[PDB]
Paper text:
A soluble form of M10.5 was expressed together with human β2m in baculovirus-infected insect cells, and soluble M10.5–β2m complexes were purified from cell supernatants. M10.5 was crystallized in space group P212121 with five molecules in the asymmetric unit. Although data to 3.0 Å were included in the refinement, the high-resolution data are incomplete, thus the effective resolution of the structure is 3.2 Å. Two loops comprising residues 145–150 (α2 domain) and 194–197 (α3 domain) are missing in electron-density maps and are not included in our model. Ordered N-linked carbohydrate is observed attached to Asn223 within the loop joining the third and fourth β-strand in the α3 domain. The carbohydrate occludes the counterpart of the region in class I MHC molecules that is the major determinant for binding the T cell co-receptor CD8, likely preventing M10.5 from participating in CD8+ T cell–mediated immunological responses. A superposition of the α1–α2 platforms of M10.5, H-2Dd, FcRn, and HFE illustrates the variation in groove size and demonstrates that M10.5 has an open groove more similar to the peptide-binding classical class I MHC molecules than the non–peptide-binding homologs. We conclude that the M10.5 groove does not contain a single defined peptidic or non-peptidic occupant or a mixture of compounds with a similar conformation. Two of the four conserved tyrosines in the MHC class I A pocket (tyrosines 7, 59, 159, and 171), which hydrogen bond directly or through a water molecule with main chain atoms of the peptide N-terminal residue, are substituted in M10.5 as Thr7 and Cys171. In class I MHC molecules, Tyr84 and Lys146 occlude the F pocket side of the groove, but the tyrosine to glutamate substitution at position 84 in M10.5 contributes to the more open M10.5 groove.
Numbering used by the authors:
A (entry chain B): 1 to 99
B (entry chain A): 1 to 39, 43 to 143, 150 to 193, 198 to 274
Amino acid sequence: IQRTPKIQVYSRHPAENGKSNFLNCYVSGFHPSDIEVDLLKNGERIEKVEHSDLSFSKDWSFYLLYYTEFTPTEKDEYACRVNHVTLSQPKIVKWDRDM
Amino acid sequence: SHWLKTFRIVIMEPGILEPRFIQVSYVDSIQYQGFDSRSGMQPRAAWMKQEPPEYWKNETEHAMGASLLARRTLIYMVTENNNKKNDYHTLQEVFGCNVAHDGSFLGGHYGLTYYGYDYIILNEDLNSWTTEGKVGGKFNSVTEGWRTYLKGECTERFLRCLDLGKETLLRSDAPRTHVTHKVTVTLRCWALGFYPADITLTWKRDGKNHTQDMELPDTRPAGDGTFQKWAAVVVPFGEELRYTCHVHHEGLPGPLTLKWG
Ligand SMILES: *[C@@H]1O[C@H](CO)[C@@H](O)[C@H](O)[C@H]1NC(C)=O
């Protein structure tokens, strides 16, 4: 039984404009593990992006954390894009600054 | 109480010639090792760098072995259940020992799946099993093996781990908390950068346990080894202050209370 991923886009520390930081895309509760995850800045898929080692939860569903360093700006709009065996078209979640 | 768990995954994707194998180990919320067939056995926690190369040699040898075994098994089961050889197939296995704050064995666990088809699972009684599926339903010494590994080697493995990371493993990092006001109102209680992950966030309409009408998400990782969590509620424009959120966490002097500033 396949299970679509749950996506959360957020910052490590609170969004302080012009202040460095880390942007996280947390995907979890999905199965199988064949998942595609992107971090976008104003639309362009961001370069060097690390991600955690694959592990699973009690219900055997998988989870991963993708992230990069980044200095937000009032102008720049970021987001996470996910494609999975259970998604017809890639899901895109925009990073809300107050979430 | 603490847990040392090892995860093994065998993945088969539609097309991939050979199955992919990965193995990670955690000591509670912290991952400290990692082996990936799509490459040896590497460290994940900063404090692990204190182990002899003779160690990683040992470790990589084991993962190497386990991997041949796991792939063989996944293929076996995909067969028994007579499934389309080419396409998704997953074999997942978890085992680990629950050790108490005082180095004493509390319990252990072991479970294996051909996800969606078979489940073989060691019971809490650590003396019985739980077959499930064509294969494994037909599952059969083996028990004592685990009862041992878990009480013995595993715990020894745990203790040795705590020895090497107590500093970061037993820390208590308190939540940096605050509240936020959103208009449709919805008040959000935030807890950030806390460790351990066990935390408590609740709201109260006029000091009364206010359930239901709220939202209770799920702790997520900050990325640095600590966590984040939030809880919010919906309250009548202006009629706000009748709501307060209470934060409870191991690293705090005592309970903390917040209201819309
Ligand atoms: C108030 O809420 C807490 C939250 O867990 C609950 O345990 C408690 O039972 C409630 N009131 C009491 C003390 O019965």
